[PDB]
Design an enzyme around this catalytic site. Structure first.
Site, PDB file in Angstrom:
ATOM      1  N   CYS A  28      -2.294   5.645   3.717  1.00 11.65           N
ATOM      2  CA  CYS A  28      -2.228   4.758   2.529  1.00 11.65           C
ATOM      3  C   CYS A  28      -1.597   3.422   2.927  1.00 11.65           C
ATOM      4  O   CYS A  28      -0.903   3.369   3.959  1.00 11.65           O
ATOM      5  CB  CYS A  28      -1.444   5.406   1.396  1.00 11.65           C
ATOM      6  SG  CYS A  28       0.183   6.017   1.901  1.00 11.65           S
ATOM      7  N   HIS A 202      -8.721   3.023   4.957  1.00 13.59           N
ATOM      8  CA  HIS A 202      -7.475   3.471   5.632  1.00 13.59           C
ATOM      9  C   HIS A 202      -6.728   2.211   6.081  1.00 13.59           C
ATOM     10  O   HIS A 202      -7.403   1.279   6.558  1.00 13.59           O
ATOM     11  CB  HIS A 202      -7.748   4.356   6.852  1.00 13.59           C
ATOM     12  CG  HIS A 202      -8.650   5.523   6.644  1.00 13.59           C
ATOM     13  ND1 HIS A 202      -9.661   5.836   7.550  1.00 13.59           N
ATOM     14  CD2 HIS A 202      -8.665   6.496   5.695  1.00 13.59           C
ATOM     15  CE1 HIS A 202     -10.282   6.934   7.147  1.00 13.59           C
ATOM     16  NE2 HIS A 202      -9.688   7.358   6.012  1.00 13.59           N
TER      17      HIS A 202
END
Ligand SMILES: [Cl-]
Length: 252
Positions: A28, A202
């Site tokens: 994250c 990502h």
């Protein structure tokens, strides 16, 4: 929702330095951003610490903003704090294919700007292939999928061409890193810069050491492997080389 993250303590430039490893959340943006600040020693954790909540990670990041304050900054900091929660509740990052720093403006650009952390990607049209340069132009990812759909419906032949050529680009570069992108990234990131690298929704912490790009290894599987800290980014496809905190090849 309470998330817990495991801290890995590494030797970074000969100093005891923490890195946050990914849990169920995965790579994250919050971990990629925090890890830049930890490696830069701009945020310090207690030397004890083994584990930390998403909530504490958020407190540290917001405290760093009030501490790095140097009337309108108050609004921006408050707006950034509200937007900061989207860094755990999904970030809609939308690349343009023209440069390693180019994204569609979204309010989250407020966070990277206020934190003064560079955001990069390497999803770049190869400027040597003229028909793709023209078909993709200045499109964001989201604008290009829309352009493909509109252009295939066109009565204009040229516009139907750009549609199919744009679709071919997306299909053929679906890994969201190109060879040209990798070359522009390598020459654009500065020696020892700490920054965030975007690929396939990502976020990774990225640096450059002796001309070579590395991604910080954040995978939970390596929490106790002191010699796995950096992974080289040297090709579009396949695994990089796992290296220790000093960028030397992990012995087999
Ligand atoms: Cl170094």
């Amino acid at each position: 929702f309470m998330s817990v993250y495991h801290i890995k303590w590494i030797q970074w430039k000969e100093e005891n330095t923490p890195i946050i490893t990914q849990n169920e959340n995965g790579p994250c943006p919050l971990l990629a951003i925090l890890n830049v600040l930890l490696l830069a020693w701009k945020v310090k954790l207690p030397p004890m610490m083994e584990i930390i909540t998403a909530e504490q990670l958020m407190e540290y990041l917001g405290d760093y903003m009030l501490d790095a304050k140097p009337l309108n900054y108050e609004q921006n900091m408050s707006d950034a704090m509200a937007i900061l929660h989207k860094l755990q509740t999904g970030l809609d990052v939308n690349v343009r294919f023209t440069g390693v720093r180019v994204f569609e403006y979204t309010p989250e650009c407020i966070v990277f700007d206020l934190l003064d952390i560079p955001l990069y990607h390497g999803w770049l049209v190869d400027p040597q292939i003229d028909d793709i340069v023209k078909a993709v132009g200045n499109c964001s990812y989201n604008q290009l999928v829309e352009k493909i759909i509109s252009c295939k419906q066109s009565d204009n032949s040229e516009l139907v061409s750009e549609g199919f050529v744009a679709e071919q680009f997306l299909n053929n570069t679906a890994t969201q890193l190109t060879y040209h992108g990798l070359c522009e990234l390598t020459s654009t990131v500065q020696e020892g810069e700490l920054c965030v690298f975007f690929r396939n929704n990502h976020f990774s912490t990225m640096t450059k050491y002796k001309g070579q790009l590395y991604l910080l290894v954040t995978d939970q599987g390596f929490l106790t492997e002191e010699k796995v800290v950096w992974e080289s980014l040297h090709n579009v496809d396949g695994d990089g080389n796992f290296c220790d905190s000093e960028f030397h090849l992990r012995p087999p």
